[PDB]
Design a protein around this ligand. Structure first.
Ligand SMILES: [Cl-]
Lengths: 270, 305, 302, 275
């Protein structure tokens, strides 16, 4: 089969940002939008189908669909608060398993939703992946970029729950990051921006969409990239309970990691 | 200067779409978001800056700026939208009044609706070079016309040649005389695929009007398709492609219509609209063109001007 | 299913490395293998491209020297390997190994003579006819788009139509299917007010002179043909269902049979779904038949 | 202002054509000019490229043969044209560039890279910031690929700038590169030099890797990314490749950030004295 179909469950802000970016980057032959409001998914797909009709965009098949479209889907994107999200995962995941494929997790809480779909159903663990702290990484690379006027791509390292930057693994242009900069100030600037965008913009659809496209490009091109993604831990860094075409392959600072593990654990119990 | 700055007025659905499509396609070194709701413009800009930080996206400068950024801007995409003609006419008069007072060499890409009215307001009320003013116009309808026949016959929409001319709101008519699918008449597809259901030219035009009203209601807005059309015109001016595309602008006697903004084939180059291409319309198509000219002017006069 | 896309490029010469590089630049496949008799050239061309794919802006596209066993899990197999009979022997030997390892890949012919090589790999083997394609006059179409573009400073993309016939010789412009920016190309002289009206026979000769000039001035033609190959790769990988001019064995189109020529054909994910026999005028029909006389003459000479 | 970007490619040989074609594939310019003494081959390369840009998915990039007068409004001027004879070529082509322009970013690819970059940045009064040399940028692509093919990991993960592999500033996705052996340093360095010549003896030259390297620098200046990448240029303190910030205005500042570095400076200096 010379076709690549990526399904996007949930056709809201983030949902339309992920599908539109998939069409802009041309990462799929057919894009299906699933959502309770079929009118929203159809309109978003129909409007996207017009964009794909441009002279520079490939003829990507955008159209409304159902869970049946997950059968031939190369990737399936899923777009007190923890329990409600888990209930949604039980419905979409219950249908995906009934029909089949890599599953990219976006719906929030991310760490919780990714855990629900990775333990409550009989799906290959490698095919389950959540954006995780990939967004915080993008933000971390942007904070230091605007601080010293340097390409964000220079900023290296990862950023826990989608919430701590591992300064030991970070480095710009090959050397450590370091008036004077404050390691706690950068962390404070991260949590504030995470609250300012949602408060001033109303949602975060562009960053999440780009982070999702990165994982899509990794799974589609089998790059074997080591990126901060969500995955049920199995003793990694004393905590328990590589992005490729076949899913996931292998994997003071330690205190913050365990602190986040205790935060998600409390959410898992609730 | 090795930089290309694109300012985008309006940070709403249509304004954030054209901004993110400009970043996905990498059509600007610095993208500036301007909107009365500065909080929305900053949030969309900051969120976009996080996307550009990806490993595959160039370091595009996304930030909340003021009209001062339009001073050295290469393109100014105005999308700040809302009787409908009068309200938008006042909005276009405010945004344009601030642009002329800072720059007069940037490219103006009209997207706000009514498209024909907005393009006519900023083009005749101010002393901005007319060539540097362009409107998406019925280019979005062209995409819809290409998609309608594409799904109807399972053919690449890009093979569907021609234009959809007229008004971008309701008076958008397809000029069947200038159309053609893959080097042969569009009406022949029924004979090629052996379809007993004859291709009704009227049905296709009506279907183009229903889909336009379905998306605006079902989806609640139209920001995806329109964002791509703006990128096409942005690519035409950034690459000096001299592409003859259907964009909206004040007519200067084409088809006998003057003092009215409509969508007709016009060459888009680095300097904007180079010239117009008066393609011979049929007696029925030309009648639709004049009908569309009276529709926009009936709305322009109703709002004053 | 398979989330990977694998393209096979037989022959790692100028054109061979032009298609693999262009593919890598556009990112069309997950793994691209170069199969050439000169394994050193294929390894060198692949390795050099492997360094490019390692860029921060380029995906991790797998570049490596492979053999015909790689064609088993391949979605597309681009072939860039008296001249008509000699190449026919290369196609029979090359295609002889492709049919043994796979029967579902897309065969995109680029080797010259294009029409001869396309007919050899399409009739002398049991490969699915729909999965056999050749660039054909798609390259000549680009030249036609650029000639009218540079002559009137109009976007070549606006130049609609086709160049049909045999690739490299007997190629004619299908004026009955052409037209710039929705209007006839002949109307450009009236729009731009050109005293020296457009001579159709002048651009046809220029279409053949430009081909000989590049080969004599540049030494070869690998850039334009590489883009045409990527266009067809995009048509099959994105299931675009595009009606483009590609070479393939005719089965009654224009009364021409037993020869491969470039005519309007719809390219889908499964290759050529069907052909579109446009209404060629009396003069163009003779050019379509004259091209068949040259192709059949080459096949008979083999 | 100017809404179009113009790039000039001096020398249309393998590397030159690879750079111009990739600039067209990535659409990093509105007009590409191929200047070369062999006007025939530059015209054909540009004419052949003009056909590729006539595609549906390719912007209308103006490809044509030009002269040094095109460098007047050229945004970037790449130079893809033992060490002495090449210095005469760099001095002749540069003397014509400075004679008509003074604001175009200059990228150097001619060999010797370190010598050719120093020849154009010393015998003329051109802004130093607007000079640049690919240098070891391609060597880094090799170091990333060798480690990528050695452990089947993304080459992008591999970090650090080869300048010799400057192991003191390298890393794989943020963790020690040696950890992959658990899931040497002098051996990959030998592979880093033997592979470069194996491609030259097997393929005949190296134009694909170096072409994207230039494009990597083209994207850095056309987008004002301020990316700190290893590029060859005039070395003051700390021509040779070192970590430098690349932006639209050229090289803004340098990043200092050892035995092999001094040996390379002595070799480049010895070649400059002989020229
Ligand atoms: Cl096409």
């Amino acid at each position: 089969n010379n076709r690549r179909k990526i399904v996007v469950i949930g056709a809201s802000n983030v949902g339309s940002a992920v599908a539109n970016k998939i069409a802009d980057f041309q990462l799929a032959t057919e894009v299906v939008l699933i959502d309770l409001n079929e009118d929203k998914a159809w309109g978003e797909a129909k409007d996207s189908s017009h964009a794909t009709s441009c002279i520079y965009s490939t003829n990507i098949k955008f159209h409304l669909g159902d869970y049946e479209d997950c059968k031939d889907a190369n990737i399936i994107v899923i777009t007190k608060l923890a329990g409600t999200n888990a209930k949604i995962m039980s419905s979409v995941m219950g249908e995906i398993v009934k029909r089949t494929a890599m599953i990219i997790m976006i719906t929030n809480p991310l760490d919780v939703a990714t855990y629900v779909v990775s333990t409550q159903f009989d799906y290959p663990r490698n095919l389950i992946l959540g954006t995780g702290t990939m967004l915080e990484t993008y933000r971390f690379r942007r904070i230091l970029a605007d601080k010293y006027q340097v390409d964000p791509k220079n900023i290296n390292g990862y950023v826990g729950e989608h919430a701590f930057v591992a300064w030991s693994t970070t480095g710009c242009a090959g050397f450590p990051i370091d008036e004077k900069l404050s390691h706690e100030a950068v962390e404070q600037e991260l949590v504030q921006v995470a609250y300012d965008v949602i408060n001033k913009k109303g949602f975060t659809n562009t960053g999440i969409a780009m982070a999702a496209c990165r994982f899509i490009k990794s799974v589609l091109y089998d790059e074997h990239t080591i990126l901060p993604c969500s995955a049920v831990l199995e003793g990694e860094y004393g905590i328990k309970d590589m992005v490729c075409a076949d899913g996931i392959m292998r994997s003071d600072e330690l205190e913050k990691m365990h602190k986040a593990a205790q935060s998600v654990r409390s959410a898992l119990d609730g």
